[PDB]
Short mmCIF file of C-alpha atoms and ligand atoms in Angstrom, two decimals:
data_model
loop_
_atom_site.label_atom_id
_atom_site.label_comp_id
_atom_site.label_asym_id
_atom_site.label_seq_id
_atom_site.Cartn_x
_atom_site.Cartn_y
_atom_site.Cartn_z
CA UNK A 1 -80.02 234.05 30.53
CA UNK A 2 -78.52 230.48 30.30
CA UNK A 3 -80.07 227.69 28.11
CA UNK A 4 -81.37 224.52 29.75
CA UNK A 5 -82.97 221.21 28.76
CA UNK A 6 -85.49 219.20 30.73
CA UNK A 7 -85.80 215.46 31.16
CA UNK A 8 -88.49 213.27 32.68
CA UNK A 9 -87.62 210.31 34.97
CA UNK A 10 -89.64 207.02 35.17
CA UNK A 11 -91.96 208.28 37.92
CA UNK A 12 -92.62 211.57 36.14
CA UNK A 13 -90.18 213.76 37.99
CA UNK A 14 -88.28 216.50 36.15
CA UNK A 15 -84.49 217.01 35.82
CA UNK A 16 -83.38 220.28 34.25
CA UNK A 17 -79.77 220.79 33.21
CA UNK A 18 -78.72 224.45 32.91
CA UNK A 19 -75.69 224.98 30.71
CA UNK A 20 -73.41 227.62 32.24
CA UNK A 21 -70.04 227.29 30.36
CA UNK A 22 -67.02 225.05 29.85
CA UNK A 23 -67.46 222.14 32.44
CA UNK A 24 -69.85 224.13 34.67
CA UNK A 25 -73.44 222.92 34.98
CA UNK A 26 -76.40 223.49 37.30
CA UNK A 27 -78.77 220.56 37.75
CA UNK A 28 -82.23 221.01 39.18
CA UNK A 29 -84.20 217.95 40.32
CA UNK A 30 -87.21 217.68 42.63
CA UNK A 31 -86.61 221.26 44.05
CA UNK A 32 -82.97 220.49 44.81
CA UNK A 33 -80.18 222.51 43.21
CA UNK A 34 -76.85 220.89 42.25
CA UNK A 35 -73.83 222.80 41.05
CA UNK A 36 -71.06 221.06 39.16
CA UNK A 37 -67.56 222.63 38.97
CA UNK A 38 -68.94 226.15 39.61
CA UNK A 39 -66.51 228.83 38.41
CA UNK A 40 -67.07 232.59 38.98
CA UNK A 41 -65.44 233.62 35.71
CA UNK A 42 -68.45 232.09 33.84
CA UNK A 43 -71.32 233.39 35.99
CA UNK A 44 -72.41 235.57 38.81
CA UNK A 45 -73.16 232.69 41.23
CA UNK A 46 -74.85 235.04 43.76
CA UNK A 47 -77.89 235.15 41.42
CA UNK A 48 -78.49 231.33 41.49
CA UNK A 49 -80.51 229.54 44.16
CA UNK A 50 -78.31 228.14 46.92
CA UNK A 51 -76.71 224.75 46.21
CA UNK A 52 -77.98 221.74 48.09
CA UNK A 53 -75.00 219.97 46.55
CA UNK A 54 -71.70 221.03 44.97
CA UNK A 55 -69.81 218.47 42.90
CA UNK A 56 -66.12 219.03 42.11
CA UNK A 57 -64.46 216.78 39.46
CA UNK A 58 -60.87 218.01 40.04
CA UNK A 59 -58.66 220.79 41.36
CA UNK A 60 -57.79 222.87 38.25
CA UNK A 61 -58.90 226.57 38.38
CA UNK A 62 -61.43 226.26 35.54
CA UNK A 63 -63.29 223.68 37.76
CA UNK A 64 -62.45 224.42 41.44
CA UNK A 65 -63.21 227.95 42.51
CA UNK A 66 -63.77 228.82 46.21
CA UNK A 67 -65.19 232.28 45.42
CA UNK A 68 -67.92 230.71 43.29
CA UNK A 69 -68.49 228.07 46.01
CA UNK A 70 -68.94 230.79 48.67
CA UNK A 71 -71.29 232.75 46.46
CA UNK A 72 -73.68 229.83 46.03
CA UNK A 73 -73.38 227.74 49.25
CA UNK A 74 -75.68 227.70 52.28
CA UNK A 75 -75.09 226.26 55.74
CA UNK A 76 -76.40 222.75 54.88
CA UNK A 77 -74.77 222.44 51.42
CA UNK A 78 -72.89 219.13 50.94
CA UNK A 79 -69.72 219.38 48.84
CA UNK A 80 -68.69 216.09 47.10
CA UNK A 81 -65.16 216.18 45.58
CA UNK A 82 -62.00 214.30 44.65
CA UNK A 83 -59.41 214.10 47.39
CA UNK A 84 -57.09 216.89 46.18
CA UNK A 85 -59.95 219.40 45.76
CA UNK A 86 -61.39 218.56 49.19
CA UNK A 87 -57.96 219.13 50.75
CA UNK A 88 -57.63 222.54 49.07
CA UNK A 89 -61.10 223.50 50.25
CA UNK A 90 -60.71 222.20 53.77
CA UNK A 91 -64.26 220.82 53.74
CA UNK A 92 -66.51 218.42 51.90
CA UNK A 93 -66.76 214.68 51.26
CA UNK A 94 -64.02 212.80 49.35
CA UNK A 95 -64.87 210.26 46.64
CA UNK A 96 -62.20 208.14 44.95
CA UNK A 97 -62.48 206.22 41.66
CA UNK A 98 -64.89 203.26 42.07
CA UNK A 99 -66.67 204.82 45.08
CA UNK A 100 -70.44 204.71 45.20
CA UNK A 101 -72.36 207.16 47.43
CA UNK A 102 -76.01 206.40 48.14
CA UNK A 103 -76.40 208.80 51.11
CA UNK A 104 -78.33 211.52 49.18
CA UNK A 105 -81.76 209.95 48.92
CA UNK A 106 -82.63 211.68 45.62
CA UNK A 107 -79.30 211.29 43.81
CA UNK A 108 -76.92 208.34 43.73
CA UNK A 109 -73.33 209.23 42.91
CA UNK A 110 -70.67 207.00 41.43
CA UNK A 111 -67.13 208.26 40.96
CA UNK A 112 -65.40 206.97 37.87
CA UNK A 113 -61.94 207.60 36.40
CA UNK A 114 -61.06 210.65 34.37
CA UNK A 115 -57.41 210.94 33.04
CA UNK A 116 -55.16 211.50 30.01
CA UNK A 117 -53.95 208.60 27.90
CA UNK A 118 -51.64 210.48 25.46
CA UNK A 119 -47.96 210.11 26.40
CA UNK A 120 -46.80 213.20 28.31
CA UNK A 121 -50.34 214.48 29.06
CA UNK A 122 -50.45 212.88 32.52
CA UNK A 123 -48.97 216.20 33.62
CA UNK A 124 -52.52 217.49 32.95
CA UNK A 125 -54.73 214.75 34.48
CA UNK A 126 -52.85 211.81 35.89
CA UNK A 127 -54.60 208.56 36.55
CA UNK A 128 -56.55 208.10 39.88
CA UNK A 129 -56.21 211.77 40.90
CA UNK A 130 -59.50 213.03 39.42
CA UNK A 131 -63.17 211.95 39.09
CA UNK A 132 -65.88 211.75 36.60
CA UNK A 133 -69.39 211.21 38.17
CA UNK A 134 -72.48 209.22 37.30
CA UNK A 135 -75.51 210.83 38.88
CA UNK A 136 -78.67 208.81 39.07
CA UNK A 137 -82.08 210.47 39.57
CA UNK A 138 -85.02 208.00 39.73
CA UNK A 139 -83.40 205.77 37.03
CA UNK A 140 -82.10 208.64 34.85
CA UNK A 141 -78.29 208.31 34.65
CA UNK A 142 -76.21 211.39 33.83
CA UNK A 143 -72.48 210.89 33.24
CA UNK A 144 -70.32 213.96 33.78
CA UNK A 145 -66.83 212.93 32.60
CA UNK A 146 -64.85 215.88 33.93
CA UNK A 147 -61.41 216.17 32.21
CA UNK A 148 -60.35 212.93 30.48
CA UNK A 149 -59.39 211.30 27.21
CA UNK A 150 -61.05 208.25 25.59
CA UNK A 151 -60.02 205.95 28.40
CA UNK A 152 -60.71 202.15 28.30
CA UNK A 153 -62.85 202.31 31.43
CA UNK A 154 -65.54 204.03 29.41
CA UNK A 155 -66.43 200.54 28.06
CA UNK A 156 -67.60 199.86 31.68
CA UNK A 157 -70.21 202.68 31.67
CA UNK A 158 -73.68 201.10 31.43
CA UNK A 159 -77.16 202.50 30.81
CA UNK A 160 -76.14 206.14 30.52
CA UNK A 161 -79.07 208.36 29.48
CA UNK A 162 -77.10 211.65 29.26
CA UNK A 163 -73.37 212.20 28.93
CA UNK A 164 -71.10 215.14 29.02
CA UNK A 165 -67.72 214.57 27.35
CA UNK A 166 -64.83 217.14 27.23
CA UNK A 167 -63.57 218.12 23.81
CA UNK A 168 -60.68 220.60 23.89
CA UNK A 169 -56.98 220.47 23.16
CA UNK A 170 -54.48 219.66 24.47
CA UNK A 171 -56.17 219.10 27.84
CA UNK A 172 -58.96 216.64 26.96
CA UNK A 173 -60.39 215.11 23.73
CA UNK A 174 -60.30 215.79 19.97
CA UNK A 175 -63.49 215.30 17.98
CA UNK A 176 -62.42 211.83 16.86
CA UNK A 177 -61.51 210.81 20.42
CA UNK A 178 -64.85 212.02 21.72
CA UNK A 179 -66.65 210.05 18.98
CA UNK A 180 -64.64 206.94 19.88
CA UNK A 181 -65.42 207.57 23.58
CA UNK A 182 -69.14 208.01 22.85
CA UNK A 183 -69.23 204.72 20.83
CA UNK A 184 -67.65 202.84 23.73
CA UNK A 185 -70.83 203.21 25.90
CA UNK A 186 -73.58 204.61 23.58
CA UNK A 187 -75.22 207.28 25.63
CA UNK A 188 -78.67 208.15 24.44
CA UNK A 189 -77.92 211.89 24.62
CA UNK A 190 -74.46 213.47 24.30
CA UNK A 191 -73.57 217.03 25.23
CA UNK A 192 -70.06 217.92 24.21
CA UNK A 193 -68.74 220.29 26.85
CA UNK A 194 -65.52 221.92 28.04
CA UNK A 195 -64.80 222.39 24.28
CA UNK A 196 -63.10 225.81 24.10
CA UNK A 197 -62.51 226.94 20.49
CA UNK A 198 -63.12 223.44 19.05
CA UNK A 199 -65.35 223.47 16.00
CA UNK A 200 -67.66 221.12 17.79
CA UNK A 201 -70.25 220.73 14.99
CA UNK A 202 -67.98 218.06 13.50
CA UNK A 203 -68.93 215.72 16.41
CA UNK A 204 -72.51 215.46 15.00
CA UNK A 205 -71.04 214.45 11.67
CA UNK A 206 -68.52 212.12 13.30
CA UNK A 207 -71.38 210.32 15.16
CA UNK A 208 -73.80 210.33 12.19
CA UNK A 209 -75.80 207.08 12.28
CA UNK A 210 -74.56 206.24 15.82
CA UNK A 211 -78.10 206.75 17.12
CA UNK A 212 -76.70 209.19 19.71
CA UNK A 213 -78.34 212.63 19.97
CA UNK A 214 -75.38 215.01 19.96
CA UNK A 215 -76.64 218.35 21.35
CA UNK A 216 -74.51 221.45 20.91
CA UNK A 217 -74.78 224.01 23.71
CA UNK A 218 -72.67 227.02 24.71
CA UNK A 219 -70.22 224.99 26.75
CA UNK A 220 -66.82 226.15 25.47
ZN1 ZN B 1 -58.39 219.98 34.03
ZN1 ZN B 2 -60.57 221.72 32.56
#
């Protein structure tokens, strides 16, 4: 029994985000089902409806899992991924940083950077290799950062309604970094995710008076 939140788009259509765990999310919009970084360790993916779309941010095992992909795919599922993950899968569409994809009529995708800035942590997520995604449904823009630190390109993110930022150590962001990241583009709604054992409640305090709705969900 996973929690989920619902959002209305400008024409009245509904987007529901179901919070699975870590960086794993299911998005439901207009009777289409979208899985992001589905990982079998966090759910029995045979019990979900079959993915119309599977989004992979990068190749690490807590994001790219073929078993989970098999359990939830159908014959006409489109997999959208970074180059390294696509290669490992042997199927799917490759997006690089700066790519826009407008070929799904109900969901525009933009691939944006997601990498480490701390010296020595490029061993984790080196620049260019991995993607964050901006998903647009009828004007509603959802930014899924993937694994990144408070990179300067976040200043370039415009009109984001909902954002997911990663807040664990040493792989992604500390609470202060996440707060700094959030302030760079002012999403209306912020879901910290991929936060492991971080005491994430401090992010609400850290963004007090920012005007950003920080929503804590079970996304360790
Ligand atoms: Zn990673
Ligand atoms: Zn990760």
